[PDB]
Amino acid sequence: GRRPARCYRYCKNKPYPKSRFCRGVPDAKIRIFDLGRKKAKVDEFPLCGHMVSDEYEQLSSEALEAARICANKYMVKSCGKDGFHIRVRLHPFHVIRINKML
Amino acid sequence: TGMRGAFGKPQGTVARVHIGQVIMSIRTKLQNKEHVVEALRRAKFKFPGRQKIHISKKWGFTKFNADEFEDMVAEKRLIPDGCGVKYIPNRGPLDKWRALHS
Amino acid sequence: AKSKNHTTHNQSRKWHRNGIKKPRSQRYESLKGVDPKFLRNMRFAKKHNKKGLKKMQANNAKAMAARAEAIKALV
RNA sequence: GUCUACGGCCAUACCACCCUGAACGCGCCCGAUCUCGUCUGAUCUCGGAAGCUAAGCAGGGUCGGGCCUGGUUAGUACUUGGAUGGGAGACCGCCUGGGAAUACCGGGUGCUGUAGGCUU
RNA sequence: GGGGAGUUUGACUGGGGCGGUACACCUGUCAAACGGUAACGCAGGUGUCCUAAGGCGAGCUCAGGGAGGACAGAAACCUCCCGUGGAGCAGAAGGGCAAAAGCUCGCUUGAUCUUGAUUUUCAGUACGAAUACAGACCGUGAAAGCGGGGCCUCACGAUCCUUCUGACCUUUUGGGUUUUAAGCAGGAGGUGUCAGAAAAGUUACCACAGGGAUAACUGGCUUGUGGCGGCCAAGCGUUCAUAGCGACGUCGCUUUUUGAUCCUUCGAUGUCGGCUCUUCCUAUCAUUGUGAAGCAGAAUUCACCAAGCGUUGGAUUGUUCACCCACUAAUAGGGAACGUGAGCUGGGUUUAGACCGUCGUGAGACAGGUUAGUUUUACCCUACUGAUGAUGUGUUGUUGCCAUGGUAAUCCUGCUCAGUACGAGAGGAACCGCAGGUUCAGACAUUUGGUGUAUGUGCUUGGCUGAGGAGCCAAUGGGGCGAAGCUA
RNA sequence: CUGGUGCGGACCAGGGGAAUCCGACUGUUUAAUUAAAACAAAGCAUCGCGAAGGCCCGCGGCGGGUGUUGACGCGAUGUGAUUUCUGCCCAGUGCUCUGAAUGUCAAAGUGAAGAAAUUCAAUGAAGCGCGGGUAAACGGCGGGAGUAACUAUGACUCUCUUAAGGUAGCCAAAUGCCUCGUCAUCUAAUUAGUGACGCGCAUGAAUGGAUGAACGAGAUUCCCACUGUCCCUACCUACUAUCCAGCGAAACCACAGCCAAGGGAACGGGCUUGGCGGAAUCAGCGGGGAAAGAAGACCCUGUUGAGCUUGACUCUAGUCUGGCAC
RNA sequence: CGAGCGCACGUGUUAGGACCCGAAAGAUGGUGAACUAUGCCUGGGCAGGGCGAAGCCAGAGGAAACUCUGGUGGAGGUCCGUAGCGGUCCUGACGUGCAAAUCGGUCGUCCGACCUGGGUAUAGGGGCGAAAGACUAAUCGAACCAUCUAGUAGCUGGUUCCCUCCGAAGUUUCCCUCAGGAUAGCUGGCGCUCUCGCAGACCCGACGCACCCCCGCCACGCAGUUUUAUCCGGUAAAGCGAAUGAUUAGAGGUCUUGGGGCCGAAACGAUCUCAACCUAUUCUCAAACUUUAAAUGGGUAAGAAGCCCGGCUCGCUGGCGUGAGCCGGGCGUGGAAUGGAGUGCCUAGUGGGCCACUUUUGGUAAGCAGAACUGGCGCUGCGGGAUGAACCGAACGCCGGGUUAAGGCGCCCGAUGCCGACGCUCAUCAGACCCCAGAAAAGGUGUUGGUUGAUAUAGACAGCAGGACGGUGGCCAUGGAAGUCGGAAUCCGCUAAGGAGUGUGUAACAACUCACCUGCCGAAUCAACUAGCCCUGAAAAUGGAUGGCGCUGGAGCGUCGGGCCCAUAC
């Protein structure tokens, strides 16, 4: 059950959707992509901090969940409870298979 | 399984990145410059490989650029409405509303 | 037992070793497949062409004289 | 200028709304015995010609949508061909040639063959 | 009518008629903007159905939404408006269609007879399917025209034989007539292994041709699963993220697991485990030297240099594995063709004999239990332990030098230290000292023990030499005691 | 009475007991791996047959065996001493009987049509199909429920469903996967044994259930006695080996035979880079020569066979029945 | 407006083998019971002892019924045991043996279903079997001999002289087809039909060649190529505020319901509200989506088979016309670069491939399975990558001279034994060249380079003159706290500071340093990142590997200059 993302790191296939033809995919562990004071008006927060990926790879939904939580705990620690709006801007749509062996 | 017709079945769900993608954008008050990158650098340790971090040249999650954005808002070509700001060209049929009050 | 399936790549050089490339063109060809009504009619024209020579050549000796005189008579 | 019948291109011709109307030209419009067909002379069909351009229709207006055509997007994305080029890899730079599409910002908003009128 | 005979008992196939048709078909994709294209690649469908769901001609517009109307409601029926295919086209999906290719009517059989041409798959063979003309009879519509099956892409079949229809056909053997038979054309009866054989098992009693083109071992590539770590640090550790751990994430290593693959041998590498023996690795259970601790001492936990030296005796199974008693400083993990059969062993697995249970009508099968079951050859070369010897120094001897290669000792217990250090106390060490020991090594025979055919001595049974003597045979007769010698 | 307590003195000559499993015992077998729990065996139980017969051989006949025979006899089977039992199922597969209760049906032979070949109709033996009996013939044995008392289980009963639904017994056994089942004994410790427990994967009644004294070159466990099996190895004797005189083969043999690492057909004696190498030899040795012994018996392919079976496909002796003739 | 007979060759086929050598089997006719299996007839053979059956004789009890007790007797598929017969265990011996199955011990039986000689019978799909498929002459789950007969094979093995010339396939379709054929393709050989370069003693092309010039001459034709035109597609890329499908998020607004409401009564009422439903936006997607839409790609044309004329024929089409056809006439060839083309017959081998750049499906990946293009290995050697099927260069007759490619030049080893140039780096596991045989995420005030941000003679930075509290218990928590932590709080003053205190400190709670400039001697300091070498992260089982020795002012890494070295290439 481990199947560490070593196997499924590189992009190596034609992008699957959750389609009419692939059914029953396990739901991505990450589900909610906005954290913090996400009702804020634009005039409030004049600073946007990005994060760009410098490698062509695949990122796992499980990893996205861990990352989002880990980056929210610290920034709650510093800024506060209504000090930010963390918005994951990437979405897991490309499913991956696993060939069970006997 | 025994390779006599091996083909996997859905399991997990990933997302594909691109060199220059933006996996996470945090918005906050400018005072939090060294809280943003400080916290966000943790995500570099949850994701595989290396991801350059970065501070945006834009007001927020807007299409726009450095704070001449707010000058443009004063000109009323940008309407603060919601988590983003709504663009306004000078086209459109309200050539009486732009008269009555632009 | 088990066998290994095919692989199909040298059959591109196989042809060009000395393969031809044109259908061996020619002048007027075999009317096989033309509209048979037109075929019949044109055949009647041909049969009464290589008949009707006291028609054809006796009404074309005139044009023979005419061109054979005029092609010089321009001078 | 413009209309009528048949059209070719089939949106620069569509849609929305407001204004304008160079014959009886199309049309609305008045009737149903003849022809015809419907439950309904609404439609279709027939016979008309009192009023009407209110509508269709034509033309115009729109910081209009749409549509066509330009720019900016960009020599970016992409790729034919090369190397004992880098990288552990993922990928990437270069030599040589080709070279796009959104967002955004301009401009335009039917042309025309044929046979037939009129200048309201 | 398996009493007896002849014969058959498909192919594909990540080894094997287990499963499944990828065995005829058709759509979408892979498929890389000719267009061909692969796998038991992915999503799917067919062996039919229709007197109309065919052919014409005319007339209407569908999906859904909005406002209204008695029962009437979320939904019956009526009306108005919006209505770019959002609906329907027999069925898979794709394409195609809006005064139609849909919906409703009206009329009808072109779903008919007859040559050739072409496309489709390819040898550019046929079957299937389709294209466009030609000659007849027709259909509808005023007519122009459209129609020779389904809006297009699938929906089906050879020789031989049978059967049916066709012309006042040919032949039916010297001639004539008539039955019947054979002909010639067109349809049908079917071959789903779908270019078209008629066909059940079992061999552990087995056989021959072959195959490493193809399994069961080791050996390789990979490392998912197995094992060892590393990074990030929300938390647990009353307080504290990192003394000791570590979730959500993630990067590797190892080949001591199990897989995946078929490269090497099928004219053979002897394939489980145990016993004996060498040696190696380290990610260290114990020991030498060290840091750390939620470390007072005592124990114990983490980590570092490190394989020199240890890592046991037994009950049960064949056991690897496991489990338990006991001792121990400790009872760490592993490789060396899953070390090692011309080293043994044969317990099990894995022939032929049998038994029981389940399955089969039966022969038989069982990765179900049980029992008996031939382990072959060394003298060849090499390696290794020993043994003669060889060039050089003229011959020969005595006495030595030492490059080089081998390596060796380890660990524990008791007294003292010291009931002290250390501690509220419960508890309780260390250094040099002294005494001995466990494992290993090299020897040795004074004593002790074992051997004893010194045939050394006596004690004896049976027989034999006539007896006393003195012996001899009984494959060393047996039996006391035993020197030198070899030995624990 | 006598001997150093020695006296079946060489020789000749049984280790023992408490248990479990299987077979009753004696007997017999796989010559050249299987001596057994296999076969046989008495005992038990079947089935046919009154000789124009049962069974059986045969190419053939007034052929031939059992038959110099006759139901206390032959021929065909099953189980397997004694004790004590053998339960339920006849729908299935066979066997057999009935026949009126007869649907299906072949030769001949009978009618009707045609000139005839033909055609048609009726006719109707065996045998199927219809109906009985048969289990010491092949064989076969179930599921959810309610429901007493805390109740579960479940006494008593609802039924689909088969033909009947495992009765008497008995067990983790030669039969139980999970399995080293759970208790107790047996030991320090016992995956072994024994004794109990049984909705028992898959126990069971002449496919025999269950017992049981004797016996067994049969499989197990335990205890006493003995001991080089072992701790822990010594020593002694004869024959080899060894050396000499004489005599003197075979197996096997591409070339020859020092290793690491590398590449390679992924494990080299030969190749590459290294480490190095000395004449001729003797006794041992089992690491290598992927040593020898064999065109691998395992597995797959073979449009290659055989032995055997059956509800395979074609057939066949024998046999039943009808017709024709003597 | 025609061709048979004989001969030589090549191929396929049938065969007296049909290239040679080989099956397991099948059939016909015979020979064996001297081994053993079993019946029959006929003869022979079985020391010594243990148990004590039936009968039998006597002695005691007793009421008789009957019962005991002692000797006799010698039965048995009985018992221990020798010959005889067998053949258990040592998994003992020998295992190129004494032996194609024996030996030593210890073993079962030894009067019965016993052991054995001779005679006689049973014969191969047959006998015989106390049943193991055992025995039938060292052979049995169908014997031996001879013949049919060299049976047959899609299956292994081999398939004998030299040079010279040309030179593949492992792919299509069908097959009881998958280790095989047929068919196409690829191959060689035999030739042909023309080009016309012995092209004079004459004489040109917008048609080539010769050029005296082609009377004799087609420059006709072709292309794995670019060019100019005009066509075709729907992948890469891109899009969702463009349809289909998936999806985050806020807003702006009414509507349909709901939570609880309220009103007080239903109200989604003003308050709500929460969803929904819109309307403008918003974050991310598609092999089975698409408005757009490339690069490389596929067709056609780039002139005599053409163009312009003139007249007939047409049973077709029909205003008159159309179109197709024919006959006559005039004008020559048209874009670059190459070169001789066209055409027929016969036909061997192959239909097990493999690898690589790039694209791509299955998988975790594989020296794995499966596809496209092109090239190789196969079929092939040479230099170089030490070693090697493919990698790089490269293509071979036999040699001499010179020159290179890939490589390389301390020594092995030909070449730097040049003045080689600028730098980086210390490794108690350094590093050292495509495929290629040493690995990462994460760290380093090891050492450099660089980006950005802060401060500096008016001395900035460390070490000195300060400064670490004077108001002050100042608020005033009394959970005690001029600091109080765990006290809600909250001022001065001095340019020096000390906030109403940094926490150690439980003596209330004191002591300690905390923070901010000029003067102490005196010049640059510090912070946050990034990427180069080296380092930690980093574990193997025989002793070993940048090729080895070795090499640290390089013989290491990056960018570079000359000069040299050699292949079968030039």
UniProtKB/Swiss-Prot annotation, chain A:
Source taxon at top rank: Eukaryota
Modification type Citrulline: residues: 31
Location of this chain's protein in the cell: Cytoplasm
Post-translational changes noted in the entry: Citrullinated by PADI4. Ufmylated by UFL1.
Subunit composition and interactions: Component of the large ribosomal subunit. Mature ribosomes consist of a small (40S) and a large (60S) subunit. The 40S subunit contains about 33 different proteins and 1 molecule of RNA (18S). The 60S subunit contains about 49 different proteins and 3 molecules of RNA (28S, 5.8S and 5S).
Physiological role: Component of the large ribosomal subunit. Plays a role in the formation of actively translating ribosomes. May play a role in the embryonic brain development.
Family assignment from sequence similarity: Belongs to the universal ribosomal protein uL16 family.
Name of this protein: Large ribosomal subunit protein uL16
Gene encoding the protein: RPL10
UniProtKB/Swiss-Prot annotation, chain C:
Subcellular location field: Cytoplasm
Modified residues (Phosphoserine): 30
Modified-residue entries (N6-acetyllysine), positions: 32
Basic residues bias locations: 1-25
Region spans: Disordered: 1-32
Location of N6-methyllysine modifications: 4
Family that this chain belongs to: Belongs to the eukaryotic ribosomal protein eL29 family.
Subunit structure: Component of the large ribosomal subunit.
Protein function: Component of the large ribosomal subunit. The ribosome is a large ribonucleoprotein complex responsible for the synthesis of proteins in the cell.
Protein's UniProt name: Large ribosomal subunit protein eL29
Organism name: Oryctolagus cuniculus (Rabbit)
